[PDB]
UniProtKB/Swiss-Prot annotation, chains A, D:
Chief place where the protein resides: cytoplasm
InterPro entries: Actin, Actin/actin-like_CS, Actin_CS, ATPase_NBD
Pfam families assigned: Actin (PF00022)
Catalytic activity: ATP + H2O = ADP + phosphate + H(+)
GO cellular component: actin cytoskeleton; actin filament; adherens junction; apical junction complex; axon; brush border; calyx of Held; cortical cytoskeleton
Protein name: Actin, cytoplasmic 1
One example GO MF annotation: ATP binding
Keywords: Acetylation, ATP-binding, Cytoplasm, Cytoskeleton, Hydrolase, Methylation, Nucleotide-binding, Nucleus, Oxidation, Ubl conjugation
EC number(s) on file: 3.6.4.-
Listed GO biological process terms: adherens junction assembly; apical protein localization; axonogenesis; cell motility; cellular response to cytochalasin B; establishment or maintenance of cell polarity; morphogenesis of a polarized epithelium; positive regulation of double-strand break repair via homologous recombination
Protein task: Actin is a highly conserved protein that polymerizes to produce filaments that form cross-linked networks in the cytoplasm of cells. Actin exists in both monomeric (G-actin) and polymeric (F-actin) forms, both forms playing key functions, such as cell motility and contraction. In addition to their role in the cytoplasmic cytoskeleton, G- and F-actin also localize in the nucleus, and regulate gene transcription and motility and repair of damaged DNA.
Keyword match Ubl conjugation: yes
UniProtKB/Swiss-Prot annotation, chain C:
Gene Ontology BP annotations: actin polymerization-dependent cell motility; Arp2/3 complex-mediated actin nucleation; cellular response to nerve growth factor stimulus; regulation of actin filament polymerization; regulation of synaptic vesicle endocytosis
InterPro entries named among the record's database cross-references: ARPC3, ARPC3_sf
An MF annotation (GO) of this entry: structural constituent of cytoskeleton
Protein name, entry field: Actin-related protein 2/3 complex subunit 3
Length: 372, 7, 178, 372, 7, 7
């Protein structure tokens, strides 16, 4: 057996570890900081780019930039910085001795995975790598070979239906709507109360407010009429400088955008209707088995009371005789990584690597042949 | 404003 | 075939720890004597650097070899910082402020070769070794800033910044790959 | 190695010394005295003008002018004379063998810096020189690398925040209320008691009265009511001619003007509101450390009870959750100069000196580039 | 992205 | 100063 690094490195937060464990060894936000003021105190040591948790702690004087947006790498230098910090600082392991199992969302541009392979082979000199689809790993982590995975990360949402292992590639529905859009929408709607977060350092504060207070309402209109007729839903959060703010109606208005993107000015259907459409695109003989094996993942599906909402919404769209099960495990946020460690620890997986030798003779165009 | 900026 | 070792050890050469306190032709302060002959240990290290990085076995024969090993390890740190600059007048400032930066010495965490380097025995020898290594660093950076930068475009020539990935026996004075 | 000269050169008093020590070598009132009578006896010595301590010694037959006012040099001949007396008489060292680290308050006319470096390079022919902000030097001397420095010298007051060594120039605040204005206010309020000080010679007497008997009231109106109720705050000062005066109510009415500039007919806010506005202009993620690391300096912050008053005021202004601390080292009167030494003694500073070559190449306008 | 959406 | 305030 061999130890193979599993680096999820989805948008939002990079989670890297070793294959064979039950939790990623190092999880840190994938951001890169740059100082935006003069240095005046010489002799204390300075750096020109902070990465990960260090960039988060010093966010007061930095311009946080995400290298990945909507599941696509848009700045490769910062991506290389993130990978270097993951390899040599978080895991503290030599990357030229271990295989690497990276993940990519479905229906992304091929140049993305091509440049990913080129970077991982020509910069870090990994002896072998493999680019897997996130939802397939999420299904691995759930310990079943049939079901529709509904993975809603921080920058992209997508559903993949699989039956007996034979994934249907013609019913994979992708939707560029995830935690970052919800964070921006919360930043927008927080003004009407009276609070204004406008700089990229305060977007982190808004994200913390979202992931600590926001939740999904089972019946949107009833909850609106309730929180608009009584002060029993307002919650108070303390900013990092002593100020306290109180949010009421906004609490469930942020995640509700997932179920009706008309708030964000988008035309696409909600995530529930997206999952239902993905199911309905499959053949008629497997739908009943998909309905009872719906799986959630990603940290955007960690909103309190989203499983019940998804069940109540799909049950309204599916025939009255199909049983709808929303298999949402309480370890959903790390599921995409957990399935990876399961995969990279298998025996036959050693025959699915992209060996460094195989790349040295064929360039980056080999990932489209060795990895679907 | 109340939080963020003055107004 | 063996790598390129230094041929400057003399029976009357003094030792610091277990490194030959070889004289150096420089202007910076330090405990090393001044050189009159046209080649000191730093010129020899810069001469042998480009070839010593490809070898993968290096037998320590005397203490001058340990000094040359240190300087070969430090040229790899100078190159990392000179790769980013775009003007020799900035490369000189970068090399000065790097030579000033205190690197680990034998017998401290972070030095890659504690096993094969005798640490100082007391405080005076510790101070002398610190000053000697600092002088070595400063003069090596000073001499290398005139090699890396070619006068045709006054920016680091690609014939020297291609050795940034090449590590001398995969060791380095900085962190493990950082 | 050769020592480096550190000349604080604040308006009011000039502090000069060698870089590396723990205290200034020569401290003398930065005044220039010229006689206003004609000598009638020959052979006792008649000099055109006295400078420094000699002027204070013979203040009777002299008119005293300050070269610096509100941190700005307004008379360059007397300033060159001050620098000459500093180099040749007070330090007993030539300028051509030492770098000079001058200090100057922020938000000054750039012509001041230009003429300073021009005089230091052309007249005295120094090898190199540097110009530093006084608050940054105070922060150096305080051992910290983060915090807000509230400096209040004889002529100018300024607050400068720094976080992790990154000064924020967009939140640096300057207020022209300082020691000399308080001395004039004391000369004005002493009239009610009947004591009339008009001449520039007696202004030094008034200044000594101030810095020996004044003290900051923790609660102003309560101290006023107390002084009105009983005579238990009255103190007696012995004039240098043999008279005695009693002051009980002006002792705190003089420094109180720092917190209520309306006494002097100014519209600006007090020093506590100034520091609070300086803090609130910084980003929300760094206000906590600025609250917990407020640092005082300068001579005018040597009044008894100023630290407690500012702490109470800021605590009344800041949110109740934040923790406030007013670091007031007992050597703050010289703190700025201390930092100067700590700046010039560093080994990572010998590249930031303005070399004579650079000056000859680029004119006096180089100080705006080689200095912050 | 290159066309449609930013990325 | 030159304009505003004396200095
Ligand atoms: N327990 C939670 N409750 C509510 N929201 C959460 C929770 N955990 C994460 N989120 C939000 O979901 C967003 C995206 O999830 P994330 O797991 O970061 O995506 P990815 O897996 O691609 O990194 C985050 O910005 C976060 O604010
Ligand atoms: N013990 C004291 N109490 C109150 N004020 C003082 C005291 N000592 C000095 N001062 C005042 O400090 C002012 C100048 O001090 P200093 O910090 O040297 O300022 P500058 O840097 O402008 O010369 C003078 O106006 C003086 O009156
Ligand atoms: Mg995910
Ligand atoms: Mg001062």
């Amino acid at each position: 057996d061999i130890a193979a690094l599993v680096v999820d490195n989805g948008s939002g937060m990079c989670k890297a570890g070793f294959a064979g464990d039950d939790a990623p060894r190092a999880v840190f936000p994938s951001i890169v900081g740059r100082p935006r003021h003069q240095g005046v105190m010489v002799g204390m040591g300075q750096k020109d780019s902070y990465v990960g948790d260090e960039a988060q702690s010093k966010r007061g004087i930095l311009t946080l930039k995400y290298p990945i947006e909507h599941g696509i790498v848009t700045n490769w230098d910062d991506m290389e910085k993130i990978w270097h910090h993951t390899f040599y600082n978080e895991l503290r392991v030599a990357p030229e001795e271990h295989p690497v199992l990276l993940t990519e969302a479905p229906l992304n541009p091929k140049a993305n995975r091509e440049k990913m392979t080129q970077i991982m082979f020509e910069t870090f000199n990994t002896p072998a790598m493999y680019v897997a689809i996130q939802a397939v790993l999420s299904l691995y982590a759930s310990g079943r070979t049939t079901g529709i995975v509904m993975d809603s990360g921080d920058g992209v949402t997508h559903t993949v239906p699989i039956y007996e292992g034979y994934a249907l590639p013609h019913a994979i529905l992708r939707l560029d709507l995830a935690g970052r859009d919800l964070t921006d929408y919360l930043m927008k709607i927080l003004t009407e109360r009276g609070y204004s977060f406008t700089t990229t350092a305060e977007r982190e504060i808004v994200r913390d407010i979202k992931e600590k207070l926001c939740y999904v309402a089972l019946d949107f209109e009833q909850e609106m009429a309730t929180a608009a007729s009584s002060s029993s839903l307002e919650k108070s959060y303390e900013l990092p400088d002593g100020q306290v703010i109180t949010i009421g109606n906004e609490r469930f208005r942020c995640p509700e955008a997932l179920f009706q993107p008309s708030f964000l000015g988008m035309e696409s259907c909600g995530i529930h209707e997206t999952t239902f459409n993905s199911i309905m695109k499959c053949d008629v003989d497997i739908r009943k088995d998909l309905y009872a094996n719906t799986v959630l993942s990603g940290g955007t599906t960690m909103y309190p009371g989203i499983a019940d909402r998804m069940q109540k919404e799909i049950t309204a769209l599916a025939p009255s005789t199909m049983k709808i099960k929303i298999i949402a495990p309480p370890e959903r946020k790390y599921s995409v990584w957990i399935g990876g460690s399961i995969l990279a620890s298998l025996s036959t997986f050693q025959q699915m690597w992209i060996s460094k030798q195989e790349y040295d003779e064929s360039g980056p165009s080999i990932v489209h042949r060795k990895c679907f | 404003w109340x939080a963020x900026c003055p107004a | 075939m063996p790598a390129y070792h230094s041929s400057l050890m003399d029976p009357d050469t003094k030792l610091i720890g277990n490194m030959a306190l070889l004289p150096i032709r420089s202007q910076f302060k330090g405990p090393a004597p001044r050189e009159t002959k046209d080649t000191d240990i730093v010129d020899e290290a810069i001469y042998y650097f480009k070839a010593n990085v490809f070898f993968k076995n290096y037998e320590i024969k005397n203490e001058a070899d340990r000094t040359l090993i240190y300087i070969t390890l430090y040229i790899s740190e100078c190159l990392k910082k000179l790769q980013k600059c775009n003007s020799k007048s900035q490369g000189e400032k970068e090399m000065y402020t790097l030579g000033i930066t205190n690197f680990p010495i034998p017998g401290e965490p972070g030095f890659p070769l504690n096993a094969i380097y005798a640490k100082p025995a007391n405080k005076q020898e510790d101070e002398v070794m610190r000053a000697y290594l600092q002088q070595l660093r400063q003069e090596t950076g000073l001499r290398l800033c005139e090699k890396v930068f070619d006068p045709q475009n006054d920016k680091p020539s690609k014939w020297w910044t291609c050795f940034v990935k090449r590590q001398f026996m995969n060791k380095s004075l900085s962190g493990p790959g950082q």
